[model samples]
Target: SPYGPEARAELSSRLTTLRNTLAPATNDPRYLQACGGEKLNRFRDIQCRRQTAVRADLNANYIQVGNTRTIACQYPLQSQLESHFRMLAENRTPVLAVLASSSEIANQRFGMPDYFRQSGTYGSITVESKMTQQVGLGDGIMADMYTLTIREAGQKTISVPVVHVTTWPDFGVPESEVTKALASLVDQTAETKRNMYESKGSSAVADDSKLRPVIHCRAGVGRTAQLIGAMCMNDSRNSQLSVEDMVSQMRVQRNGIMVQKDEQLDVLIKLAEGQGRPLLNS
Candidate 1:
């Protein structure tokens, strides 16, 4: 029943700042190295176009959270696939966290595996997971984990785990249960890496390339950013970052519409508040 000029002005200014803040960070140079590298060109087409109301094209390759190097990308395709492969090739990062489901792959029935195989971008990929787990995420959403053996012509084959998640739609956020499940997966992976180091001793240094968790969602902007944001906030429990600060940093480095939708941002906020816990033992 009561609203005033001050409220309208305040809201207007807030929106104005948000629009600017969310604008594509085209000038950001995080991705510049990847975008301009000789080997990188084989993977990405260097077409960093600005969009209406999109976060600036930071084109970032990796963002570090604690000791974890979190990498994000769009769906693997022609240039995007090459760009990703090039980035991963030099970095030596292990484990691929693919956030989209097979059904999400429109034309290709085999989804990422087939597309990746045909593209010949990430070398030869062989499925290591014998069975696909059916973890119903409600509303037709489901998540599955797969591991693939990747190799170059004479290079040694390495196992890369792919997290195929359908819990969150392209433009939607995951429900509470799905989010918890997602967290559990992250925890388990981190724990596995930790134990590997423990058993191997100091000489067994984790490959920097493998340390970066390559995460991707189609378009590599919306859902990708939210997942990354949540992971950053979760691991940074001892840090002074809030959801707002973390999202801002993501945009600054990643330079996209990190967590574009309000509801999605809310999900990250909740996760940061010590709300969800990893269900699996890491």
Candidate 2:
């Protein structure tokens, strides 16, 4: 009964209000100013938030919810691959969560190049897939985990983990099973980042931004926002911010089109009430 009638009604009402207040137009001045003349963006209407965007050659934004920070971006094109890797390297991103499936790539639906399956050099950084494993998230949702060895010119070689969730369709809400698994995936990524931070002998306080995991789908707005919103809601430190506030902050930090669908918003609401399977249970 965690997601029973009353809870669902309240959450749904909040979602309605959020949609009315937070929806942004393509010509919104905030988006125009932040994304003006940005050629690397995957969608013209999906623009990056100006304030948190890394001053790099890529179209990626750094979003912090509570103590957690993540980089959200569109899938990189062949020409933008170098800048993408550079962004990862410079930010010291420990993990990447790819919501795009291989089938989407094969169908040319995402317009993203399949670069992680093999070793390749992008500008000054070389990426080699060191290991691959099939990890099961609850209720039969499975993800591909890759350990990538990254070699940059002047820096020490680093290992980055990538979790690829293929079942979630583009611009659509995932089933309950997939939603729970997505929460598990976020935990896995956070653990990886924590371990990396611990090894550096650095305090977790000041170095939070450096260890952010990167997440992306096709346009970097819809599915990307869903996961980030879930991350925010799941974190205990963010209790003061309501779901609406979190989503609004995300739009300000990433893109105005975040959590692009109402269904996606509903899923996040259910997650907030602990209706989904084993969320952050570890």
Candidate 3:
């Protein structure tokens, strides 16, 4: 036990971070129901405004969340990369183009040919990720964020963790630490946003005018909503928009934002409101 201090300190730190993730993820009211109904064998079912999922027009401008078939199977395919891009183009939107898998090695990484049934970048702005893993907690394999990203975006050729697949409950760590981690994630997400923002968060970005970065995961709704919602809240300029407003945009754009896992939504709720700001105000 003489060396306990040093070793225990590391363990404590790791647990602290986990506790932080768990604590805030639960405080949010949106997914307060936890994983009760989330035990679906196939997919998770979150909620959202009716319009975001069904509408073909942007003027409808709905956001929240809803069920969707915008998912993919590593071998078969979900919605096809080309079709997703077509929707993005139709919406005049840019996609984050985060393609990743739980593959344990790079050799197993998916390729444009896999989803496109051809080769080359699927979109004007897209990239691959290294989210491979050894094993997963739930079903299929695991890749922490990488797999999660794929699922939200609707990538096929591999399994992923979307909403239903993700769950991090907040055990109430120091408010400071929890927010700190969130800030860290915000920086990462924003850096990705800013880079693409300059290079054209969308085809609109190619226009050289002010435009909000268009984020897409796969279907261009779930992962997109979660990222944009957090970024908008943390942004000083866009901070003017209320959480309700942000979630509204999410519902409009991405179904229910966290339509897969009801509990995963708490992350967005926390990220939006955890920075000492009101959830919504006059």
Candidate 4:
């Protein structure tokens, strides 16, 4: 389930009240716009709490149930992954991992990567790994394509339907670098997709509803924001959303979210242009 019955109970009592107290913003809030021009929410941390011991077959993805403050695991390791995976499976919980290509341990099927980490932005995407731990064959050969690793974890199971999101990955690279960004991002986002579908409790009734696709890059300012904005601009909701506002919405999550360079902006422009419908108002 979450952690302990006592803790979950305490969280459930607190969050229920908090939920009733706050208002969900349709767009960016005024104070957030004034404070830093970001869509800031009164609630910063997302936690889950429940009267039920968080039954695996009860919840769906993105559904906040209880307060997650107490049981957050800070450092993730191989053992944690294996154990977590096993526990979630045993509980029939759906697990979601936001993996950078580097974190992955060579997937034969994906032809992507096989390492324990993947490409991500954290602090700074330095081309050089100050502490390289023998990352397989391509350890020290890659060029401008620096392999910055980012990893986030979530899980689902029949008995444990709770989906947990931990530490937002911090990629050091700015948006300018995302142009050369590999197809690896596609995999990172696919992880998000997997999260949505699998978050539905395993063995639960299928709704067959189409889910919205929203994803962005680091700081929600540049690549991350651009990616999500591009999706919104081209997707069915194109009429109601604009990339500028989309980027604005992302900043609510990723503070200081901004394009690192004009070149990166060009990449987004080209992406929209190539899609048959230009979003940049060429």
TM-score of each: 0.65, 0.80, 0.39, 0.31
Cα distance off (Å), candidate 2, residue 65: 2.3
Quickly count the clashes in candidate 2.
0
Which of the two candidates, 1 or 2, achieves a greater TM-score against the reference? 2
Clashes of each: 14, 0, 27, 51
Best by TM-score: 2
Q: Write the per-residue lDDT of candidate 4 for residues 8-124, one digit (tens) a residue.
A: 354334433433443234332311221343222212332112221122221111211011000111112222233333333333222222222332323344233221233222222
Which of candidates 2 and 3 reaches a greater TM-score? 2
User: Candidate 3 on 1-282: residue-level lDDT in tens?
Assistant: 312344334433443443343332322342223244332111223322322322221112223222111211111123235444333333332222232222311233332133321223544424334443222322231213332222224432322211111222242332223333433343454355446546743454454222223333333344444544555555565644554455444543433433223233444545544564434434
lDDT score of residue 7 within candidate 1:
35
The residue-level lDDT of candidate 3 at 2 comes to: 16
Q: Candidate 4: what lDDT?
A: 0.29
3 or 4, greater by TM-score: 3
Give lDDT tens digits, candidate 1, residues 1-282: 012344334433443465465453444333343335433221243322232111122343455543345766556554344344545433344456667655666556423434432224333422233333545545566766555444555554444555667446433344544665565576566457546555756332455434566776665666677677666645635255544455555554554455656666556645654543321111
TM-score of 1: 0.65
Worst 10 residues of 2 by lDDT: 273-282
Q: What is the C-alpha lDDT profile of model 2 across 115-152, one tens digit per residue? A: 66679988778989855788776555578888777788
